[PDB]
Design a protein around this motif. Structure first.
Motif, PDB file in Angstrom:
ATOM      1  N   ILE A  42       0.826  -1.205   0.000  1.00  0.00           N
ATOM      2  CA  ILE A  42       0.000   0.000   0.000  1.00  0.00           C
ATOM      3  C   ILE A  42       0.864   1.260   0.000  1.00  0.00           C
ATOM      4  O   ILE A  42       0.491   2.281  -0.591  1.00  0.00           O
ATOM      5  N   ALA A  43       2.029   1.206   0.647  1.00  0.00           N
ATOM      6  CA  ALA A  43       2.811   2.417   0.902  1.00  0.00           C
ATOM      7  C   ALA A  43       3.201   3.210  -0.341  1.00  0.00           C
ATOM      8  O   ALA A  43       3.047   4.443  -0.323  1.00  0.00           O
ATOM      9  N   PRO A  44       3.725   2.603  -1.437  1.00  0.00           N
ATOM     10  CA  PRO A  44       4.275   3.421  -2.532  1.00  0.00           C
ATOM     11  C   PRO A  44       3.291   4.423  -3.113  1.00  0.00           C
ATOM     12  O   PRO A  44       3.567   5.626  -3.128  1.00  0.00           O
ATOM     13  N   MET A  45       2.146   3.949  -3.594  1.00  0.00           N
ATOM     14  CA  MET A  45       1.093   4.833  -4.081  1.00  0.00           C
ATOM     15  C   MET A  45       0.134   5.130  -2.930  1.00  0.00           C
ATOM     16  O   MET A  45      -0.529   4.231  -2.404  1.00  0.00           O
ATOM     17  N   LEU A  46       0.098   6.393  -2.516  1.00  0.00           N
ATOM     18  CA  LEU A  46      -0.655   6.841  -1.353  1.00  0.00           C
ATOM     19  C   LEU A  46      -0.718   8.363  -1.373  1.00  0.00           C
ATOM     20  O   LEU A  46       0.261   9.016  -1.755  1.00  0.00           O
ATOM     21  N   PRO A  47      -1.847   8.965  -0.989  1.00  0.00           N
ATOM     22  CA  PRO A  47      -1.928  10.436  -1.006  1.00  0.00           C
ATOM     23  C   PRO A  47      -0.893  11.111  -0.124  1.00  0.00           C
ATOM     24  O   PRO A  47      -0.403  12.191  -0.478  1.00  0.00           O
TER      25      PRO A  47
END
Lengths: 98, 49
Positions: B37-42
């Motif tokens: 989840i971490a790489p693409m995240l607001p």
């Protein structure tokens, strides 16, 4: 002319059978009951149970081990006779592996 | 009372070995999900040691 059986066969020398405990099935039942009793009596398990319930379980196990069942005797010394009588006349002869 | 102490010990023993998959999940899969989840995240992760 030979048929195999998972359990051993000991023929009966009498024609008026009655209850007795000398055979593998009753021995197996008694040993299972004794193992359960020893599991209950384990020092890591007895304190988890109340005093009266341990006695109730012990009595139930004793009665179960001393129950009067003729099924082990039948399986030992009457079932092979019936199987050997039925086997020849049968629309599919016995096909067995050791 | 003796019966209450026996019941407490029985409950503690019953709850010591409760079969729940949550600790193994946290050990073995949850970090993988977080790393996915971490790489693409607001808001990108911001951590201190």
């Amino acid at each position: 002319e030979v048929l195999l059986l998972p359990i051993d066969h000991q023929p009966a020398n009498v024609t008026t059978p009655t209850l007795d405990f000398t055979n593998e099935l009753t021995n197996w039942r008694a040993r299972v009951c004794e193992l359960m009793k020893n599991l209950v009596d384990n020092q890591r398990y007895q304190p988890g149970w109340t005093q009266s319930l341990v006695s109730s379980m012990r009595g139930t196990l004793g009665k179960l081990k001393l129950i009067k069942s003729m099924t082990p005797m039948y399986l030992q010394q009457l079932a092979p006779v019936e199987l050997a009588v039925i086997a020849p006349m049968l629309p599919f002869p016995p096909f067995q592996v050791p």
